[PDB]
Amino acid sequence: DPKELAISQEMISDYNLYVSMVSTLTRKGVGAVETLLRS
Amino acid sequence: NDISLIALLAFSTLLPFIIASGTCFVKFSIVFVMVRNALGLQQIPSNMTLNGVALLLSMFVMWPIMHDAYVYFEDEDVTFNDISSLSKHVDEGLDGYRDYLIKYSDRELVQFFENAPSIFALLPAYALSEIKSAFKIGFYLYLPFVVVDLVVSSVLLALGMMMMSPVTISTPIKLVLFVALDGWTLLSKGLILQYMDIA
Amino acid sequence: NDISLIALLAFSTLLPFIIASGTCFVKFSIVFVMVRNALGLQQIPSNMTLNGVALLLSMFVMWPIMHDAYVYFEDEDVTFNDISSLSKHVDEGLDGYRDYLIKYSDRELVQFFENAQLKRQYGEETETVKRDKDEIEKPSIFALLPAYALSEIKSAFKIGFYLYLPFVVVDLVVSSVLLALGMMMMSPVTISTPIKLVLFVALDGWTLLSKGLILQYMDIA
Amino acid sequence: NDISLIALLAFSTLLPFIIASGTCFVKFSIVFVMVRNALGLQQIPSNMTLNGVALLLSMFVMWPIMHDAYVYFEDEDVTFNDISSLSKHVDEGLDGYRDYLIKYSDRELVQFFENAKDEIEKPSIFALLPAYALSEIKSAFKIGFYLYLPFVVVDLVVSSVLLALGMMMMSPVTISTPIKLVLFVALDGWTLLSKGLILQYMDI
Amino acid sequence: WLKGRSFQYGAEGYIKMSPGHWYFPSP
Amino acid sequence: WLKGRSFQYGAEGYIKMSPGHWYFPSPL
Amino acid sequence: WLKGRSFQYGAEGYIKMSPGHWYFPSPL
Amino acid sequence: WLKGRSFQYGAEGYIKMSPGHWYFPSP
Amino acid sequence: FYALYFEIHHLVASAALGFARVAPIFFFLPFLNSGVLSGAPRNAIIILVALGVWPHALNEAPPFLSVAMIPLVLQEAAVGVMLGCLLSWPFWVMHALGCIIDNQRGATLSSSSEMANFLNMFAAVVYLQNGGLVTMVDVLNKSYQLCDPMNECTPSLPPLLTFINQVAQNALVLASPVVLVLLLSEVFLGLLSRFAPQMNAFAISLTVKSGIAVLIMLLYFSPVLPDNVLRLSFQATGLSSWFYERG
Amino acid sequence: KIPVTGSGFVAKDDSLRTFFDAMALQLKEPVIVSKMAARKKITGNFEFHDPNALLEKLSLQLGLIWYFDGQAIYIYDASEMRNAVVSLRNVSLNEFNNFLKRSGLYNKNYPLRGDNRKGTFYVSGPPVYVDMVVNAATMMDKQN
Amino acid sequence: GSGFVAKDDSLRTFFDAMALQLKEPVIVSKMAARKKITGNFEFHDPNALLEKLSLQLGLIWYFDGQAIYIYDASEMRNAVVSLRNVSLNEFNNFLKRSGLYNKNYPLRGDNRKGTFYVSGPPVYVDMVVNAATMMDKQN
Amino acid sequence: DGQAIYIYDASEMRNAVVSLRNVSLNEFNNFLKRSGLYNKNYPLRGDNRKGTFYVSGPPVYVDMVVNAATMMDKQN
Amino acid sequence: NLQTQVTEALDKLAAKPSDPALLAAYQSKLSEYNLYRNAQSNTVKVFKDIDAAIIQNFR
User: Fold this and answer.
1) What's the domain count of chain M?
2) CB contact under 8 A, A24 and M59
3) CB-based contact I11:A19 (threshold 8 Å)
4) Which H, E and C letters describe J53-119, residue by residue?
5) Per the record, GO CC terms (chain M)?
6) What is the residue range of M24's domain?
7) ∠ CA(I181), CA(I187), CA(I192), 5° rounding?
8) Is J69–L56 a contact, with Cβ atoms under 8 angstroms apart?
9) Are C201 and D21 in contact (CB < 8 Å)?
10) Which of these, B110, I52, K15, K69, could form a disulfide with C146 (CB 3.0-4.6 Å)?
11) Element (H, E) at L54
C-alpha cells in the first residue's frame, strides 16, 4: 500500500493535468479560428 | 521538463498572429477581396466566405511544416553535456520552417535587420514582400474589368444615352461574364500552384 | 448515508450548468437578445439585467417542478435495504423532471440519439427503434437534453422571426421614401430608429409577449 | 443570529443584481446611452462614466428606502417566541420596498403574476419585480423616443439644403454633427433632463 | 381492424391496438 | 426466393428479417 | 407468397390449419 | 470470383472475400 | 474503485476533441452564432452535443494518448471549418441574393443592409421547420464515421477549388428575373430621355426601381423561392466526396 | 369482428414483451423479460398447449435463458449469464443441495459443479439464480 | 433435412442457429463478433463441425457444462500460481470429478509441487486461478 | 393486505433472502398465519426448520416480511 | 527497495517480542521509514501544484 498508493498518486494527478491541458488547447485552438474569421 | 510546457502552450496563444503575419494567409486574403472590389459589390461573396476558404488553403501549406516540426522534436535525445549543443538542436527543428521563409523573402531587408540567419529578421521582410507580390497580381486581374466598363459607357455615348448612370448597367455585365468564364475557380487554383504542388 | 451528502454536494456544484442547459431559460434568453437586435440597439438595455428578467420568469415556471424534489428527497425513508430498490428510488424521484423533458422535446430529434448511441454502444448490428416505443418505453436522461436544447433553439428562433418582421417592413419603406427623393447619400437607420421604437411602445410588446411565454407552459384559472 | 448572518451576507453578494433589476438605475442607465446614440456618437464619453453618474443619481432617491430598513431592524424585539410572529416581523420590514414597487408597476400585470383589495394584503415580492423592470424599460423607451425626435429635424434640414443645391454626393454626417450638439448645449439639455428625471420620483 | 395489429383469437379474444393498448370486444 | 435473407430450412424453419428479427412461416 | 396454404407453429413442428377466408398479409 | 481474393484450394476449399469474411462454397 | 473515476475521466478528455470538431459550426450557422446566443449557456450546449454524438464507446480509453496533439487540433479545426462552410451553403446564397436585389435598386451606392438580412432569416426559418436539425446533426454523425482521428483525414483539396463559383452560379440564376426587368426598364426610360433631353431621368430611376424590385419578386416569392431552399441543403450522402483519410 | 375458427396468437412485429405476456395465461405465472432481451422481434402464427415445452424450444432457437422460481418466470438473453466461485468453511455441498432440493429452487439444467464433500463449488446461470445462491451460501457460514 | 443457409452473417446470428443442435446456448464475444461468413452448412455432426470451424476461422471455445463460450484466439491469457499446502494431484482430481477438466487445455506443471502454469480462454483461467487460491485459504 | 389492494406491473417484482439468527421459519410463518398477511400465491421458500429462506413478490410485501423478520430477531 | 529491508526485520520480533536490542533497531528502522514516506508524498505534491499553476496562469 505505501508503494501502490504512491504509484496511484502520480497516476491520478498526471492524467488530471493531461485532461486540463487537452481542454485548454482546444479552447485556444478554436478561439484562434474565431478571431481569424473576424480577421 | 515543465519548461517545455510553457513554450508548447505559448505557441497556441501566439498562433493567431503567426497566421496573421508569417504565412501565405497574407497573400491569400488580399487578392480575393481586391477582385471583389473589382466587381463593385462589397457583400458578395460575403467576406466570411473569403476568410473561410483562404484559411483552409493557407492551412494546406503550413500543415506539412507543422508535422515536420514535431516529427523531429519527438526524438527525446536532445539532452547533452554542453548548453549550446542542446541549443543547436532546437535550431535544427526550426530550419524546416525557416527554409519556407528564406525562399520567398528578398536579400535586402534580411541583412538590414541583422546588423541593426536570424529568424526575427525575416517575418517583416516576408509580409512586406507578400503585399508587394499581391498588388501586381491584383493589377493584372484589374485591367479586364477596366476595359469592359469602358466599352459599355462608350456605347451610351455612341447613342444619345449620355445622362444615365453607367454603373447600374455595367455591374451585372461585369459579374455575369466573369462567372461565365468560371474565374473564381481559376484565380484560386492559379494561386495555390505557386506555393505547393496542388492535387 | 455519509456519501449521500457527497452526492448532494456534487449535485450542488453542477447546478447552474443544468440551469444553462436543462430548463426553459434558453427560450427566454434567446428571444430577449433577438428583441434587442431587431430594434437595432446594440448595448442597451444592458443585458446583465436582461439575464435577470429572463431568469425570474423561468424560475417562476420551474418552481412547482423542483419543489416536489425536496419533499420527495427529504423523506426519512430514503435508505432502503436492497441495492436495486435504492437505485429504483432515484428513478421514480427523477420521473417528474423526465416527463417534463418528454412533453416539450421533439419526437424525432430525441429518437435520433438512441439509434446514434446504440451503434456506438454495441455496433452496427443493433436494429433501429421506431416511433412505436413511445407508448411504453422511456429514454435515458442523457439522450434527452441535447435534443431538448436543440428543439428549444428551434422554437425560440421560430418566435424570433415573427417579431423581426414588423420592423423590416418599416426599414424598407424608409429606404424607399429617401430614394423617392434624391437623398441617396444618407444613412436611413437614423431616421428609422424613432419609428422603430414607436412601433414597439405603442404596440406594448413587452407586456403581452411576457404573458405569451407563460401561456406557452402554464394556464390561467 | 447565526442564520441572520447568512441573510445579511446574502443581500450583499446579491446587491449588484437587485440594483441591476429592481430600481430606477435601469431607466437612468438606458436614457444616458440613447442620448449618445441620438447625437451620433459611439464611444464618447464612455460606458463607465455614464454608469457612474447614473449610479449616484439613482442612489439619491433610493437611499431613504435602504436607510429605514436599518433603523427598523436595529430594534430590540427581534427575539420572538413564535415562528410566525418573526415571519410577520420580516414581512413588516419589506413594506418600504413593496410600497415603492406598487407605485411604478402595473396592477394588471402583477395580477397576472399573482394568478400563477391590496389594502388587506400586499402582493408577494417575487410577483412584481419583473413587472417593475418590464414597466421601466417600456417607459424609458417611450421617453427615449421623445428626446430622439428634435435631432431628426436637424438631420433632415441640412440634407435638404444640400440637395437644394446640386451637391448630392456629399455625406451630411460631417456637417450635421456640429449642428447636432449646439442644439444640445444651447438648450443646456443635460442639466435639465437630470432635473426632471429626479422630479419624476422625488418631489421638490 | 386487424390489418397491422396483433391479436389473440379463440375463447378470450383481444386485439392489441398498440404496445400499450388493449381492446376487449363483446361477442 | 427469400431474396437476401438467411434461413434455417427443414421441418423447423425461420427466416431472419434482421440480425434481431425472426419470422416463422411454413416450414422452409 | 405462401400461395394459399398457412401453418401455425407450436411445440412439435408445424400444423396445417383448416382452410379459412382470412389470410395473413406477408412481410418480405 | 477470385480476382483480388486469397483462397485455399483442395478438400477444405474456401474463398476469403475480405480479411474478415470467409466463403465456404458447395461441395 | 478506481475505474469509476476513470470512466468520467476518459469522457471529459474525449469531449475536448468533440468540442474541437463541432465548435466552428456554432459560429457559422445563422440561428446558432454568438449574435443570437449568449456566453453563459453556449458552452454547456456545445459539450453535451458532442457527447451525444461521439463515435467511440465512452468507458474505453481514447486513442489520443501522446500521438501528435497540437497538429491534431489543427486537423479537427480544419475539418470543422470545412463542415461549417458546407452547412452554411443555402444561407450564404440566400444572403447573396438579397445583396444583389438591394444593390440593383440603388440604396447601397453610399459605398463608392436589412433586405439581405430578411431573406437570410427567412431561409433560416423555412429550413428549420421541416426536418432541419435532424439533418444538421446527421452530417456530423457521419463525419465521425468517415473521419475518425488518428487517421489524419483532410478536406480533399481538388473539389474545394470550385466552391466559390458553386455558390456563384446558384446566386446569379436565383437573381435572374428581377435584374432583367430593372435593366429593361432603365433603357426604356433612357429612350425617353433621348426623346426629351432635359428630363434628368436619373432622378426618376430611383423613384421607380424600388417599386419594381419588390413587385416583380412578389410574383415568384411564394411558389418558387422556398423549394430551392430545401434543394440546396447539403445532405449526408455526399460526405464521402469531400473527405478522405490518410492512412 | 375477429374471424378465425381455432385458437392461437398471431404476432405482427411483436417485441418479445407483448409476446410472452400473451403466453402468461397458458403459463399460470407472470413473465418478467429483461431489458436487453426485449429488443428482439418475432412474427408469425403461434399456439400454446404445453408452454413449458414450448418455452424451452424457443429459448434455444432465439437464444435465451429462463428460470422459474415458483412465483414468476424470468427471461434473459444469452449474453447476460454470470459465473461465481465460493468457499464454505464449515458446511458441505451435499448439505447445501439438500436445502435447494427441499426448498424447491433446485434447477437440473443449471446444477452446481463441485466436489461432493468440500467447501468450494462453481455456480453459473441466470442473474437472478446466481445472486441468490451466493447470498444463501454466505448467509449459512455466518449463521453456523 | 436440416441446415443453415448463411448469406453474410456476423458470427453471432450464425452460432445461435447451431444452439439447438448443440444442446447448450452459445455466447460469442464482441471481438469475435466482427467476422462474417457465407455458405450452405449442414448440422449433422456439430461437435466436429464446431471444432473444424474454430481452427479454420481461428477461435477458441470452452464448454463448462451449461453453455459454450466462444472467444477469438487473440484473447488467450496465462498465469502461474503456487499452492502452499496442497499439491497438483488433488486439484486435478477435483477437476476430474467436478467436470471442469478440459483435455484440450490441461494444466502444465510438476506432479508434486505448488507451482504450475495455465493458459486458455478468459473464463477458464479466471476460474482456475480463483479456485486455486480459494483452497489454500481454507487450508 | 386487508385494507387496500395494491397493483404493480410485472417488472417491479423484487426478491430477497434473509437470515433469522434465533427464530425458526415455522414460527414466523405461524405469526403470519395468525396475523392475516399470509399470501398463498407468493409463499416463503426455504427449509422447514432453519433460519434462511427465500421470499419474492410485490415491494410492499417484501419490505414487510424483511422488516418484520429483522424486528423479530432484535426482540429475541 | 527500502520496504524489503523494512519487511525483513518484523518477523524476528514477531517470533521474539521481548528482545531489547531488536525493538531498538526496529524503532530505528520504522521512524526513518516514517521520515521517508511523507517526504516522498510532500515532494511529489509540489511538482503537481507548480505544474497546475502554469495552466492556471495561461487559461
Assistant:
1) 1
2) yes
3) no
4) HHHHHHHHHCCEEEEECCCCEEEEEHHHCEEEEEECCCCCHHHHHHHHHHHCCCCCCCCCEECCCCC
5) cell surface; extracellular region; type III protein secretion system complex
6) 1-59
7) 125
8) yes
9) no
10) I52
11) strand L52-57
